[PDB]
Design a binder for this molecule. Sequence first.
Ligand code: 3HE
Lengths: 102, 51, 42, 52
Amino acid sequence: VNVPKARRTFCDGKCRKHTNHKVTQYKKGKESKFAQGRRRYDRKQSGFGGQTKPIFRKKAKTTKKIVLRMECTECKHKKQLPIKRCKHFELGGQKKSRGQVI
Amino acid sequence: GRRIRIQRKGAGGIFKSHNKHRKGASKLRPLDYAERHGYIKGLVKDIIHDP
Amino acid sequence: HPHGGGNHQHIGHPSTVRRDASAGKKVGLIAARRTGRIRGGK
Amino acid sequence: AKSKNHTNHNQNKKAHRNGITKPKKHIFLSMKGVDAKFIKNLRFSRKNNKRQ
RNA sequence: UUUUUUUUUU
RNA sequence: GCCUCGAUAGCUCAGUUGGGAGAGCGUACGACUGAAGAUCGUAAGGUCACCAGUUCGAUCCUGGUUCGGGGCACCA
RNA sequence: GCCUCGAUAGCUCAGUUGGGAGAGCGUACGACUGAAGAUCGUAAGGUCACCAGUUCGAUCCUGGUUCGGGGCACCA
RNA sequence: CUCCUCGAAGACAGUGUCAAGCGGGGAGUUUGACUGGGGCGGUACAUCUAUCAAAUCGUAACGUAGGUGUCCUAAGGCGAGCUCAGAGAGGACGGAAACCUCUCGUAGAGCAAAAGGGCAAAAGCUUGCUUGAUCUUGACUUUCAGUACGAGUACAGACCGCGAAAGCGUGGCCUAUCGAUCCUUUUAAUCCUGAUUGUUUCAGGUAAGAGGUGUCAGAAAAGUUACCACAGGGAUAACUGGCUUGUGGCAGCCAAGCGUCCAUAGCGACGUUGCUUUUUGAUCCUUCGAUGUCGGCUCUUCCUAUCAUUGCGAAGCAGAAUUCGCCAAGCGUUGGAUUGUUCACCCACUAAUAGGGAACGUGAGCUGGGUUUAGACCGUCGUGAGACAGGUUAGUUUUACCCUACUG
RNA sequence: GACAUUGUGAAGAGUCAGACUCU
RNA sequence: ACUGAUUUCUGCCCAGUGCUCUGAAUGUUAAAUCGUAGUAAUUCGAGUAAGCGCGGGUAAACGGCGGGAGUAACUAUGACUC
RNA sequence: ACCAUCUAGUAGCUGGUUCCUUCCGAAGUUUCCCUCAGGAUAGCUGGAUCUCAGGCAGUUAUAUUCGGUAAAGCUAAUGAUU
RNA sequence: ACGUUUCCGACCCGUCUUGAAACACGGAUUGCGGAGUGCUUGUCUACUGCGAGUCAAAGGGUGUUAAAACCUUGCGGCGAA
Ligand SMILES: C[C@@H]1C[C@@H]([C@H](O)CC2CC(=O)NC(=O)C2)C(=O)[C@@H](C)C1
């Protein structure tokens, strides 16, 4: 899958019109240790009793829905669009050619 | 499982020493003035079998 | 016993056990640096 | 002990026991699911017709 | 450094 | 007994829609040598186990007879 | 019966996504040697097991077929 | 004389707390489902196409042939132009096949992929420009409980793309290509809250996505038990019985051939019609608050598909002998070696050494050799506990005095 | 392994600006 | 712990799993400690022991200990070769 | 091991579940579930009744449509095939 | 009418089950005992009182046929957004 690095698309921000967006790939942030879930989980785990929450062990997916973060070049408003599952992804790769020798 | 014979030996029951007829402990004399600054003479009264 | 059982009389696991093994497990050749007949001087 | 055993044996009899109920007659009166622009114009038309 | 063999009788 | 497999020159093995029976060893002769052995060339080795059938045509395909070889064959 | 694995010169074995078919021995030629063997210099060699398909092109990728090999085949 | 009892070690060891490593020595728990018993095998578990399917829709099996977890900045959108597979006839090197030209060419091509539909100034090929694969809410279809996800349909509002325009466009020509709660994370507002007043961090919220549950409406999960246990099950296997008869056994029909000649004395191929339940299978109807599960011994009776004997007919019947067939179960159908053996094989006699049934007759009749618990050995397998229609050895055989039957 | 129990002296090295750190 | 009188012997394998032996080993490592930023919670970085990983030993430790072709003057077999 | 208690432990499984008449009267099917001897869900069923006093029907007629099964065809496409 | 005798009919009940007289299980006989309850919380239905209200709690006051009955609520529950 090849996706260009620039896209003219609708902007939900102040623009409310079609504008240019710089496209990048979204990446999950670092998990904080002061999130309520982490605090609760740490307190629950501390002490005697062993593991207190399930541990997932049956992964079956081999891909992920790639999320494109597109930032408007006029207000810096950022959109997130998921695309379909793909094994290989590249941003702004070389475009396909037609009628060329191999 | 159950405790193994090795483990059962520490309680010191049927595994205690059979010492009814022992003739005593083998020990030199306590260190004292005679042995530290000279010598003391003793007479071998007996040679015996210690079970 | 750790060696007991089986349809054949066999240990089933290496008989050399580490020094810090638990009380009910420390049987056999404890902390053995080597095994087998001594060929030479030791 | 196989236990899938699908069948449609006694189902028409059950369906017909209390009759097959046909749809009501007012179902064609509702203006639900009709074009929004048409509905808007209908509201405007109805809001203005002088009664007398 | 390497260096094996040579049918039978005459 | 049943599932089968195979039977080709004195011996051992190839071969085919089915349209020729080949190879080796062995045998006879010739070349070679003082003479042999070995080596070469030729001549050679067959009812294609037997019978019946199907085919325009069967060593091969179908059935049967003989010979053998490999496997299968209560029970709780 | 089920589950896999493999099939490549005369023999034993590699090989690539798919664009090369290799290695050793064997075979053939020349040389060294009185001659053979070792040695030196060369050459030719495979059913990529058989088919169908996939894409530009398949020994390779997919499916089926033939042969071989391995493992399971347990209660009562 | 000296307030060190005499030595050794000495602020290390030891002890207290926390941290990390090891830790079946020990604890707790788990060790999917479907399934012509279970296990092994497979996935028919979420899922699409053609068929089954009996002309609306719908319709099952571990029914049949296949497919799915992807791929694509174009293989999405749109405008324009063109026509494909193939055939025929021509053209230096050029050949069956390179490239050029003309005729014919209903799609016999192509359209990412399975199958089926669909498509010709296009949905295919070439090419220009593009990002409608964007933002927002409702309605509806499909599955359906008329729940949810997924997928899709027709609009409405916005901003856009292509086109001269009408128009078309919310991803792929259509039918599969996928995911709840909790938690984490990101994007959004010049947003709300932190309740003693405020500011800034920090944390928590409202809305939309992603991180994944393939057992796909979504637990966190390895074995063994022959030392075994409990609640049940004839919903479910192992022995008898029942249906079936593939397999086993037995008997016919036609005659191509064999039989020196001669199809039918005796046989009878290629084909084909049956019968039996003494084989083994298939099934799962009865029995799991139990029908004692092999064989032998003993003892009755029964059937013949007749080995012998009685009476006969036919021969490739000149007779010991032998073969075929008919009426015929009255009466016989043995002694032994090996094996638990049924079978098998051999020795010997014999008129003959026929085949079978009766809950594979017969264990409150025996025996207990085998199978079939617990002990033990070997081989293979397993890390191990342990497994093995593989071999081996030892292993409790209970009760009738009742009714009937039978004997007196 | 860290901290406490844990005190009294020397030598070296390193930090600082008489203290600290180690050995 | 295994083996199991006497006699005679006890072959090859340290790759796997164990056990064990050294450690210079910044390869990987917790708490504590130290440094940077911040007004603080806190953030970032450095250290960071044993273990593990690397190296050596050990089978009278657990255990394990192969295939296919050709070949001798009748055949057969194959000492021999690949 | 035995004794008492937690303890009337839990059981989707087995057994039982006690008067008479009258009226109505089933289901073994759909979807989801570590679901398949069980549940929830819809269906089938009973009871209470309430609002009314012509629009309905497991039946026909008229009109109009849908379908690709039986038959038919292969001297019509595809695939066999003398 | 639980006597006898005739003619016709007549398999043993309960249960699980597609299917029981079953070669399926429980049942030798008789007496007595023996199993859908209590409470909390919901919801619907029926009846009663009052009705934008209704019920009032703990408590207090009184009551000697005094655990009753009778009286008593700026405030509380539910309802009225
Ligand atoms: C989104 C997916 C799931 C999620 C999480 O494990 C799921 C939860 C579900 C729940 O309700 N309780 C739990 O204890 C686990 C998670 O962190 C990852 C595995 C990814």
